[PDB]
With several copies, the nearest count.
Chain A
Amino acid sequence: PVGQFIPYSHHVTDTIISTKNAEYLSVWKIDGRSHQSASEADVFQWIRELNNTLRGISSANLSLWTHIVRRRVYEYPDAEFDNVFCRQLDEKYRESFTGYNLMVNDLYLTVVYRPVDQKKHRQESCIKALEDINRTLGQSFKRYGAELLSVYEKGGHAFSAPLEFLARLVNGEHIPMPICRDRFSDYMAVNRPMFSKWGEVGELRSLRRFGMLEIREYDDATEPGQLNVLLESDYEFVLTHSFSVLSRPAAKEYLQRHQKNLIDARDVATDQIEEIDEALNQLISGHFVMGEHHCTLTVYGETVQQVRDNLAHASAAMLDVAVLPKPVDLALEAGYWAQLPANWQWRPRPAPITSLNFLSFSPFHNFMSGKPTGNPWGPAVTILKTVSGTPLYFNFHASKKRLLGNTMLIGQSSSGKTVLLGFLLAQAQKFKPTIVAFDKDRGMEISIRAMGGRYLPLKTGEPHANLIFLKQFVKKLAAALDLSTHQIYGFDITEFLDNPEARTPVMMYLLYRTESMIDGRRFMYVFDEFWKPLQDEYFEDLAKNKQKTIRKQNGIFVFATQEPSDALESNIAKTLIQQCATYIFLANPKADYEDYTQGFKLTDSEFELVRGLGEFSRRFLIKQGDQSALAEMNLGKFRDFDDELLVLSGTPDNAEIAESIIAEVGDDPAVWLPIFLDRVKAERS
């Protein structure tokens, strides 16, 4: 049947998949670096840094395949949660997304090794070859972020992660395939593609038909990335590159052969011969390896007419750059079967290409997209639009016990902090965690009262292991508490935020009940200003000590601060600042350049982007891990954004109206908001 074309046999060492002809393989899922954020210098430096390990480990056995896949992600489930106001917000903001891209970019580089009693010892040598190759590749891809796919247990019979990607490459849809006693190529093809008799187009059944554009460029690329135009598009596709690195002796012979062939001609072109001779000279001195290369683009369209239109648009976009696609009318079968790693024979037209050109054609550049699903709490907490028209799937747990959860939001309170804080909290309600909130203002209280939990403002007139409580109490002497009542809580810090010394004792006592009540159920601590609590003598020490255990539990500290220079990154605050997983920087009209860049390790070009947002532009820079993007949760007409923005923002008049209505209603099924709806806008009008 179709088992002829697929060569993989069985799984070895828990991280390599053996193959027919004894050719060990290893798959890496790479999250590309953000090309947009960085300047022009960083991209060249990244290309050269990759070339470092490429030529460093280069050998005739080595080879690499690169696949980029644009997936219409359905892994977002549109979960259900009981609150009414958050339901309104969720539904409207889902409605806002109509007509916008939901495609994501996934990049894969699969390193493959094909060597050209003592049989077992030679087998050990062969496997340790790929062992060292993977080790050096991992060390070289630390900044990029590389997850070596490996087996993962499931209910007593294992699944191998690498098989899933190689399946997706041929099946076209993510199908979980387990490790069974068979050979993998026997049954990994759940879906067999059917190609046309003449071969112009191909068909795949879920039906999605596909067509292929052959791309081959024989001269050096001007730009570090010439194919990034495709990263935004309305068509799913798979783009492939194979680099079977030739050994140097073969490279010399090929160059001499091509040089002589160009010499023997009726018309002599002095420019091309000089260029080829220069490349020959560079080969010994500029130590870049050459390998056979071929590039194929496999778009996806429901109907052949739509497929042809997508091909035409891709060709036009490519010809905007100086790359001319050659359409494939026949041998589409060979080209498509060339996609599977270790299928050397079916390559349509390999062409020896310098390593620098290969990296220029396929550098790991992709827009930020995060991980829509699989996060430790569940699906992505929320999805945010970005500039350049690509969707961003926001999740807190993104790090470099368990991944870090702490988040930093830096910006002025007026500059969109309120709406973003409220929207993120409302989305995070979908997992139903416990929330403890401290607000620099009375703004948070209306938002909290909208949710299930009732805010507990602090006002004048309303105030054995307990040895710790007594000893902390003595420290102050020197100068409905628990989570049983309801899930969510809010305690005003506006009373003691500006106070010189009243904040410390009440913070010390409150942390007792707050931490001790749940203690391992879940935690999503929120502080509007976290630099005010940290100036304590005792609180910061316990935070730094116990962050490890809180991280072990389902505990995330969503810190925040209006001014980072105000937080001044004191000696005690250093750990809290540095262990932040995801940073969201708002537009800061005033930002001390040196402290801002050096404290956050923010790149110079990223700082240029932050300044570019300037003042009073409702955009933010999200730097998760080691990549960045300019995401704006702008709220316009396509039209409830007006009202759920009106309630979300917190003002003293809104605060007093909220408290009076809550106290006076008695029983109100969040019907104060309809009262709150018009009772406010009348005053502003």
Chain B
Amino acid sequence: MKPPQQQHEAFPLFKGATRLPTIWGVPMIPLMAMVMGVAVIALTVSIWWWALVPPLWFIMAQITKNDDKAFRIWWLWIDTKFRNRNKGFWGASSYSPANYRKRR
């Protein structure tokens, strides 16, 4: 049925895949985006620019502790499925096998 077997002769993983890089409970790159957004708010107003940071940051931390590095998935979606055009025309995202007809 399966070559798998219940044996203690194991190579432990140590579960270091949960302790992926983080600084204050969040990966730095999404937190870099949070800082960029806080600066964007600071362009509009300084009173609540720093104030908006703890809410978003806490949301990031609590999401990451649930399912780590989901932000990479979010970025991949935004980059690939979102940016594609003519999604409605084909009924789904499509990529022409052939190159640009003009290409000039």
Direct contact between A and B judged by beta carbons closer than 8 A:
yes
Q: What is the interface of chain A, defined by CB distance below 8 A to chain B? A: 1-5, 35-36, 38, 40, 43-44, 186, 189-197, 199, 202-203, 214, 216, 218-226, 228-229, 232, 254-255, 257-258, 261, 275-276, 279, 320-321, 326-334, 346, 348-349, 351-354, 356-357, 360, 363, 365
Asked if B5 is at the interface of the complex by the 8 Å CB criterion, the answer is yes
Most buried by B among A195, A214, A226: A195
Interface residues of B in 15-62 (CB under 8 A from A): 15-21
Contact A1 B100 (CB under 8 A): yes
Q: Mark B79-104, 1 if CB is under 8 A from A, else 0.
A: 01100000100111111111111110
Nearest chain B CB to A270's CB is how many angstroms away?
16
- Given contacts A228-B2, A348-B101, A365-B3, is CB(A2)–CB(B95) below 8 Å? yes
Closest to A188 in B: B97
A residues in contact with B90, CB < 8 Å = 194
**Residues on the A chain within 8 Å of B9, using CB:** 44, 223
Q: How many residues of B contact A (CB 8 A)?
A: 45
Cα distance A308–B13 in the bound complex, in angstroms: 31
**CA distance in complex: A285, B96 (Å):** 40
User: Would you mind naming 16 contact pairs between A and B with Cβ atoms under 8 Å apart?
Assistant: A189-B97, A192-B96, A214-B98, A219-B13, A220-B10, A225-B2, A225-B3, A255-B14, A258-B16, A275-B12, A326-B98, A330-B74, A349-B69, A349-B103, A352-B16, A365-B3
Contacts of B19 in A (CB 8 A): 254, 257-258, 261
- Judging by beta carbons under 8 Å apart, are A197 and B16 in contact? no
Complex: A415 Cα to B100 Cα, angstroms: 61
Q: Which residues of B contact A352 (CB under 8 A)?
A: 16-17, 20
Residues of chain A within 8 A of B2, CB atoms compared: 225, 228-229, 320-321
Q: Once bound together, how far apart are the Cα atoms of A333 and B12, in whole Å?
A: 32
Bound CA span A108–B32, Å: 40
Q: Name the distance in Å between B25's Cβ and chain A's nearest Cβ.
A: 12
The answer to whether A195 touches B76, judged by C-beta atoms less than 8 angstroms apart, is no
Chain B interface (Cβ within 8 Å of chain A)? 1-21, 67, 69, 72-74, 76-77, 80-81, 87, 90-103
| Closest B residue to A43 using CB positions | B3
The 5 A-B pairs with the shortest beta carbon distances in the complex, nearest first, are: A225-B3, A258-B16, A356-B11, A189-B97, A2-B95
Closest to B69 in A: A349
- Are B16's CB and A357's CB within 8 A? no
Residue in A closest to B22 when the chains form the complex, CB atoms: A257
What's the minimum C-beta distance from A148 to chain B, rounded to whole angstroms?
Answer: 26
In angstroms, how far is the closest chain A Cβ from the Cβ of B28?
Answer: 14
Cross-chain contact B4 with A223 (CB below 8 angstroms): yes
Bound form: Cα–Cα A346–B76 in Å: 8
Of B9, B20, B80, most A-chain CB atoms within 10 Å? B80
In the complex the two chains form, what is the Cα distance from A365 to B74 in whole Å? Answer: 36
A349 touches B16 (CB 8 A): no
Query: Is there an interface contact between B10 and A221, defined as CB atoms closer than 8 Å?
Result: yes
What A residues does B10 contact at CB under 8 A?
220-223
Closest A residue to B17 by CB, please name it: A351
Expressed in whole angstroms, the Cα–Cα distance for A373 and B30 within the complex equals 53
Known contacts A222-B10, A349-B69, A357-B13: A333-B93 contact under CB 8 Å: yes
- A330 in contact with B95 (CB, 8 Å): no
Distance of A32 from chain B, by nearest CB (Å): 11
Interface centre among B10, B20, B76, B99 (most CB of A within 10 A): B76
Contact present for A225 and B5 (CB under 8 Å): yes
Does A353 contact B17, Cβ atoms closer than 8 Å?
A: yes
Query: Which residue, B4, B21, B81, B93, has most C-beta atoms of chain A within 10 A?
Result: B4
**Which chain A residues border B17 with CB–CB below 8 Å?**
218, 351-353
- Bound together, the chains give a CA A597 to CA B77 distance in angstroms of 58
Q: Are A228 and B93 in contact (CB under 8 A)?
A: no
**Shortest Cβ gap from A583 to chain B (Å):** 23
CA distance A216 to B20 in the complex (A): 14
Q: A354 vs B96: C-alpha distance in the bound complex, in angstroms?
A: 28
Q: How far is the CA of A202 from the CA of B10 in the complex (A)?
A: 38
Q: Closest CB-CB distance, A301 to chain B, in whole Å?
A: 17
Chain B residues, Cβ within 8 Å of A254: 16, 19
Contact check: which of A35, A330, A331, A351 meets B3 at CB < 8 Å? A35
The reply to whether A194 and B93 form a contact with Cβ atoms under 8 Å apart is yes
Complex Cα gap A44–B5 (Å): 11
Per the bound structure, the CA–CA distance linking A192 and B7 in Å amounts to 46
Given contacts A194-B94, A349-B99, 7 further A-B contacts (CB under 8 A): A192-B94, A220-B13, A229-B2, A261-B19, A329-B96, A330-B74, A354-B13
Q: Are B12 and A220 in contact (CB under 8 A)?
A: yes
Asked if B11 contacts A354 (CB within 8 A), the reply is yes
Residues of A within 8 A of B102 (CB): 349
Interface centre among A222, A223, A327, A354 (most CB of B within 10 A): A223
Contact B96 A334 (CB under 8 A): no
Complex partner residue of A192 from B11, B16, B74, B97, CB under 8 angstroms: B97
Are A193 and B94 closer than 8 Å at their CB atoms? yes
A334 interface neighbour in B3, B76, B92, B94, Cβ under 8 Å: B76
Q: Which residue of B lies closest to A216 (CB)?
A: B67
> Taking A44-B9, A186-B99, A193-B94 as contacts, is the C-beta distance between A220 and B73 under 8 angstroms?
no
Bound: A258/B15 CA distance, A: 8
